[PDB]
Design an enzyme around this catalytic site. Structure first.
Site, short mmCIF file in Angstrom:
data_model
loop_
_atom_site.label_atom_id
_atom_site.label_comp_id
_atom_site.label_asym_id
_atom_site.label_seq_id
_atom_site.Cartn_x
_atom_site.Cartn_y
_atom_site.Cartn_z
N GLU A 1 -6.40 -8.96 1.71
CA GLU A 1 -6.13 -10.36 1.52
C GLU A 1 -4.66 -10.58 1.20
OE1 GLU A 1 -8.80 -11.53 -1.63
OE2 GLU A 1 -10.25 -12.20 -0.24
N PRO B 1 -9.09 -13.15 5.21
CA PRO B 1 -8.89 -14.50 4.70
C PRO B 1 -9.15 -14.65 3.21
CG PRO B 1 -10.86 -14.35 6.01
CD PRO B 1 -10.22 -13.05 6.13
N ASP C 1 -7.62 -8.93 -2.91
CA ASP C 1 -7.90 -7.60 -2.46
C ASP C 1 -6.82 -6.99 -1.56
OD1 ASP C 1 -8.57 -8.05 0.20
OD2 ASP C 1 -10.61 -8.32 -0.24
N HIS C 2 -6.98 -5.72 -1.28
CA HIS C 2 -6.06 -4.94 -0.52
C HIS C 2 -5.60 -5.59 0.77
CE1 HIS C 2 -4.00 -1.16 -0.62
NE2 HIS C 2 -4.10 -1.10 0.68
N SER D 1 0.79 -1.17 0.00
CA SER D 1 0.00 0.00 0.00
C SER D 1 0.86 1.27 0.00
CB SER D 1 -0.98 -0.11 1.19
OG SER D 1 -1.75 1.00 1.45
N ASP E 1 -8.97 -2.89 -5.94
CA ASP E 1 -8.78 -3.97 -4.99
C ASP E 1 -9.55 -3.72 -3.69
OD1 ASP E 1 -7.37 -2.12 -3.62
OD2 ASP E 1 -5.59 -3.28 -3.34
N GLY F 1 -16.17 -12.40 -1.64
CA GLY F 1 -14.98 -12.70 -0.88
C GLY F 1 -14.22 -11.49 -0.45
CA LIG Z 1 -11.60 -12.64 1.64
#
Ligand SMILES: [Ca+2]
Ligand SMILES: [Zn+2]
EC number: 3.1.1.3
Length: 392
Positions: free
Chosen positions: A358, A364, A355-356, A111, A315, A284
């Protein structure tokens, strides 16, 4: 195969904390484990930096330097005077005194940490003309960081970094939503935001601004003060640097060093809508970003600001278009990975479906082999030639 023995140093973004904070729940690994420990167990010496999550990139870079070689944080007399904060900050023992003796490191950043990493390299290599001149004219001492000539950094790897800023900051209710995001991460660590913990838990490290959570104060309460403080309202903040205009400004002076390797990894967790052209969060996606942040990012356009359809994929926190490397206000070059890692340019490693949060294991994702990701990365970093030879 191993060409270098440089240690790896992990660095967080607008959220992050030390290994001993958050009761041991790691930023680097979260619910999945402890990334530093994994790397170490596999033979890749690794360390973790912890700097002010909300502080400017500059502040963070100064903190990182000193955290690295040891000493008292020196933000620069010119800088301090310009922004109205303390010149000196906290004191560190030094994670790697070896740096002042010829050693080098690989920096893996997530990030906003990617902006910080870049800036650090820049300062290390070039110093600060402004700080040098101020020292001369006013007869104040000067930190070695501002002198130039330091070459610690063999490479910088960025993961989900808003090199060009993120449109998230353009939300009308950005302020509230941003702190709700901090609250969400606390939540991920099983830490309540409405409780006045007597233990520090999450130190924001605002020594320069003279801010700290007081006794009897919960995070919710603390965040309300913070929102009205210079760390939120001044230009010398993560808030500013995180914006498209702010990232652009940073990009105007923070350039890729020809002596360092740069790798960029992008992340996305969205799908396009056929009728709208917008992007929507996938199933998710962390609950911290799915409800409001992702949809905003996937639908926000601004012609005058230069935000067009390419910016929509995200993300959950950052626009994927911003992640391959600095472009707006930048002279840096970006080349798509083709099997050869190039020095002094941004090697665009592509886009990963995570994603950011994950990607660091804070949220998770059973389908994402996080251990393999980082080990593959470490393997690649260790294979970098400190001096590549020129040939056919
Ligand atoms: Ca997730
Ligand atoms: Zn500052």
């Amino acid at each position: 195969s191993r060409a270098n023995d440089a240690p790896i140093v992990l660095l967080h973004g607008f959220t992050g904390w030390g290994r001993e904070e958050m009761f041991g729940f790691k930023y680097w690994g979260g619910v999945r484990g402890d990334i530093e420990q994994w790397l170490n167990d596999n033979g890749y010496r690794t360390y973790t930096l912890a700097v002010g999550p909300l502080s400017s990139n500059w502040d963070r870079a100064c903190e990182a330097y000193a955290q690295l070689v040891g000493g008292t944080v020196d933000y620069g007399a010119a800088h301090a005077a310009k922004h109205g904060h303390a010149r000196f900050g906290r004191t560190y023992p030094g994670l790697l005194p070896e740096l002042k003796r010829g050693g080098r490191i690989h920096i893996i950043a997530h990030s906003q940490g990617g902006q910080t990493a870049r800036m650090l390299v820049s300062l290390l290599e070039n110093g600060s003309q402004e700080e040098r001149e101020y020292a001369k004219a006013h007869n104040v001492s000067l930190s070695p960081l501002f002198e130039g000539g330091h070459h610690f950094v063999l490479s910088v790897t960025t993961i989900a970094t808003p090199h060009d800023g993120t449109t998230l900051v353009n939300m009308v209710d950005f302020t509230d939503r941003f702190f709700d995001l901090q609250k969400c991460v606390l939540k991920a660590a099983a830490v309540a935001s409405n409780v006045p913990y007597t233990s520090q838990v999450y130190d924001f490290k605002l020594d320069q601004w003279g801010l700290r959570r007081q006794p009897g104060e919960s995070f919710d309460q603390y965040f309300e003060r913070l929102k009205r403080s210079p760390v939120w309202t001044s230009t010398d903040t993560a808030r500013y640097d995180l914006s498209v205009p702010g990232a652009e400004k940073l990009n105007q002076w923070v350039k890729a060093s020809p002596n360092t390797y740069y790798l960029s990894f992008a992340t996305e967790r969205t799908y396009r809508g056929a009728l709208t052209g917008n992007y929507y969060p996938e199933l998710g996606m962390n609950a911290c970003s799915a409800v409001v942040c992702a949809p905003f990012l996937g639908s926000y356009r601004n012609a005058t600001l230069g935000i067009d359809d390419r910016w929509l994929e995200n993300d959950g926190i950052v626009n994927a278009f911003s992640m391959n490397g600095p472009k707006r206000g930048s002279t840096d070059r970006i080349v798509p990975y083709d099997g050869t890692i190039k020095k002094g340019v941004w090697n665009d490693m592509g886009t990963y479906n995570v994603d950011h949060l994950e990607v660091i294991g804070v949220d998770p994702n059973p389908l994402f082999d996080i251990r393999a990701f980082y080990l593959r990365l470490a393997e690649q970093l260790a294979s970098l030639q400190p001096h590549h030879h020129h040939h056919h």
